[PDB]
UniProtKB/Swiss-Prot annotation, chain A:
The name this protein goes by in its record: Ras-related protein Rab-7a
Organism: Homo sapiens
Regulation: Regulated by guanine nucleotide exchange factors (GEFs) which promote the exchange of bound GDP for free GTP. Regulated by GTPase activating proteins (GAPs) which increase the GTP hydrolysis activity. Inhibited by GDP dissociation inhibitors (GDIs).
Domain notes: Switch I, switch II and the interswitch regions are characteristic of Rab GTPases and mediate the interactions with Rab downstream effectors. The switch regions undergo conformational changes upon nucleotide binding which drive interaction with specific sets of effector proteins, with most effectors only binding to GTP-bound Rab.
Ligand binding (GTP): 11-17, 28-29, 31, 34, 60, 119-120, 122, 150-151
One GO MF term attached to the UniProt entry: G protein activity
Membrane topology: Peripheral membrane protein
Record: residues binding Mg(2+): T16, T34, D57
Modified residues (Phosphoserine): S66
Disease linked to the protein: Charcot-Marie-Tooth disease, axonal, type 2B: A dominant axonal form of Charcot-Marie-Tooth disease, a disorder of the peripheral nervous system, characterized by progressive weakness and atrophy, initially of the peroneal muscles and later of the distal muscles of the arms. Charcot-Marie-Tooth disease is classified in two main groups on the basis of electrophysiologic properties and histopathology: primary peripheral demyelinating neuropathies (designated CMT1 when they are dominantly inherited) and primary peripheral axonal neuropathies (CMT2).
Post-translational modification: Phosphorylated at Ser-66 by LRRK1; phosphorylation is dependent on protein kinase C (PKC) activation of LRRK1.
Enzyme class label: hydrolase
Motif (Switch 1): 22-35
Taxonomic path: Eukaryota, Metazoa, Chordata, Craniata, Vertebrata
From Swiss-Prot, chain B:
Lineage of source species: Eukaryota, Metazoa, Chordata, Craniata, Vertebrata
Region (Interaction with Rab7): 25-247
Subunit structure: Associates with PI3K (PI3KC3/PI3K-III/class III phosphatidylinositol 3-kinase) complex II (PI3KC3-C2) in which the core composed of the catalytic subunit PIK3C3, the regulatory subunit PIK3R4 and BECN1 is associated with UVRAG; in the complex interacts directly with PI3KC3 and UVRAG. Interacts with Rab7 (RAB7A or RAB7B) (GTP-bound form); Rab7 and UVRAG compete for RUBCN binding; can interact simultaneously with Rab7 and the PI3K complex. Interacts with CYBA and CYBB; indicative for the association with the CYBA:CYBB NADPH oxidase heterodimer.
This protein's name: Run domain Beclin-1-interacting and cysteine-rich domain-containing protein
Impact after mutating H224L: Disrupts interaction with Rab7, translocation to cytoplasm
Region (Interaction with CARD9): 3-64
Subcellular compartments: Late endosome; Lysosome; Early endosome
Leader peptide range in chain numbering: none
Organism of origin: Homo sapiens
Disease: Spinocerebellar ataxia, autosomal recessive, 15: A form of spinocerebellar ataxia, a clinically and genetically heterogeneous group of cerebellar disorders. Patients show progressive incoordination of gait and often poor coordination of hands, speech and eye movements, due to degeneration of the cerebellum with variable involvement of the brainstem and spinal cord. SCAR15 patients manifest cerebellar ataxia in early childhood and delayed motor development with delayed walking. Additional features include dysarthria, upper limb involvement, abnormal eye movements, and hyporeflexia.
Length: 176, 247
């Protein structure tokens, strides 16, 4: 069993760091804009069963154009990361889901697993309220919400275990 | 055996040209006898007349005459023009589409490098973002910088090398090495496209495969030829219906 996970969201919200923190329990404060989509692999186990996640982080800046996104296909789960301190990236959440459902194109797109990460809860200029983001995810077919910090390992292991769990469910169905 | 050069009735087209430049040599500014303008020589590149010191009948192919017809024959140029054309030989100054787009259909060897250059510019953008194709990026610079980052700029060197039929070969060698890296390296396959129209996820198209697909060049989204040509691009229909409901 192999799961494909795709991490989306505006530049500098913490996609490369949440994935470095989860896969390698590492974190460096030096920012390094990711220019092309690439992946890491973590093996986890659910119920005696060995499963392997393939986690893709993206270039949230503006190295989209002329370059395609065929790697969305077969996505078993999609992760949307916003910055709790920059309220604009929470606004562009709709934009990222809507485009992903158009490029990956799963059967039944509104029962497709999304997981929303509010990153950087360790900083003190937090603008987006938890009960505001919790409501937005309740709007979109009840999708999980995690306030996380790649810096301090806050709810990171929680989030990517939910992503694994939800992907695992999604993968076993379009085999049906 | 004196020459006969004084003339009350010089050629009217030359009298118009010399007089347009106040009877002054275009290279040294010497003021010439209006009754002796037969002595002057026309520089076929600068378009102006010169004294026989500044212009000594050096011959040179002419940019405009290479870009309007495929004409490489040498023409009499002023010393200043021979010097300057030699200087800018390898400079990417001439934009074929902006100057004369029709030439792309009269010269086959030139359309071939235009096409080869279109592929190389898409391969380059992908190799800039694929950490495994970095020795292929170094091979992209065995040719001038501008051949793979722009599509319509040529230098006089490239135009000649195209007529001698050698520029295609050096570029075909590169659009093959690149085409096999993408077939075999699926960090580059991951940046391929799925046609938004048909959604066939079994045929991942890339922008350099101009046989198969046509690329939008506002969105640079990639679609099959079959699926596009008619109508607009769906990508921008949303992107600017986005700010549409935001405003
Ligand atoms: N305090 C704090 N800083 C963080 C956190 N997550 C990321 N950062 C920092 O924010 C900066 C940007 O985050 P990155 O993950 O590197 O950028 P990204 O989201 O991958 O954006 P792109 O790589 O351009 O697509 C980096 O310097 C991180 O170290 C966090 O949870 N808390
Ligand atoms: Mg990144
Ligand atoms: Zn002169
Ligand atoms: Zn590659
Ligand atoms: Zn198509
Ligand atoms: Zn378009």
């Amino acid at each position: 069993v192999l799961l494909k996970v795709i991490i989306l969201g505006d530049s500098g919200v913490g996609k490369t760091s949440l994935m470095n923190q989860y896969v390698n329990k590492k974190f460096s404060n030096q920012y390094k804009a990711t220019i092309g989509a690439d992946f890491l692999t973590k093996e986890v186990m659910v119920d005696d069963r060995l499963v392997t996640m393939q986690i893709w982080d993206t270039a949230g800046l503006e190295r989209f154009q002329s370059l395609g996104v065929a790697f969305y296909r077969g996505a078993d789960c999609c992760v949307l990361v916003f910055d709790v301190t920059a309220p604009n990236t929470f606004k562009t959440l709709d934009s990222w889901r809507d485009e992903f459902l158009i490029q990956a194109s799963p059967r039944d797109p509104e029962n497709f697993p999304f997981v929303v990460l509010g990153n950087k809860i360790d900083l003190e200029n937090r603008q987006v309220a938890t009960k505001r983001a919790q409501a937005w995810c309740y709007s979109k077919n009840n999708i999980p919400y995690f306030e996380t910090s790649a810096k301090e390992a806050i709810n990171v292991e929680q989030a990517f275990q939910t992503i694994a769990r939800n992907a695992l469910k999604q993968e076993t169905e379009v085999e049906l | 055996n004196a020459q006969i050069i004084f003339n009350v009735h010089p050629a009217p087209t030359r009298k118009i040209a010399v007089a347009k430049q106040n009877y002054r040599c275009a290279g040294c500014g010497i003021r010439t006898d209006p009754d002796y303008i037969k002595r002057l020589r026309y520089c076929e590149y600068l378009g102006k007349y010169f004294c026989q010191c500044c212009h000594e009948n050096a011959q040179m192919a002419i940019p405009s005459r290479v870009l309007r017809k495929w004409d490489f024959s040498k023409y009499y140029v002023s010393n200043f023009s021979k010097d300057l054309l030699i200087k800018i030989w390898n400079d990417p100054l001439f934009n074929v589409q902006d100057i004369n787009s029709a030439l792309y259909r009269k010269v086959k060897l030139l359309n071939q490098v235009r096409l080869l250059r279109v592929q190389l510019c898409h391969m380059k953008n992908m190799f800039k973002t694929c950490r495994l194709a970095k020795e292929l990026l170094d091979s992209f610079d065995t040719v001038p910088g501008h051949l793979t980052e722009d599509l319509h700029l040529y230098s006089l060197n490239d135009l000649t090398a195209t007529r001698k039929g050698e520029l295609g070969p050096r570029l075909a060698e590169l659009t093959r090495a690149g085409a096999t890296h993408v077939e075999r390296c699926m960090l580059c396959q991951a940046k391929g496209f799925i046609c938004e129209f048909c959604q066939n996820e079994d045929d991942i198209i890339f922008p350099f495969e101009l046989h198969k697909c046509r690329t939008c060049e506002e969105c640079k989204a990639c679609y099959h030829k079959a699926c596009f040509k008619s109508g607009s691009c769906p990508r921008c229909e949303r992107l600017q219906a986005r700010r549409e409901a935001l405003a």
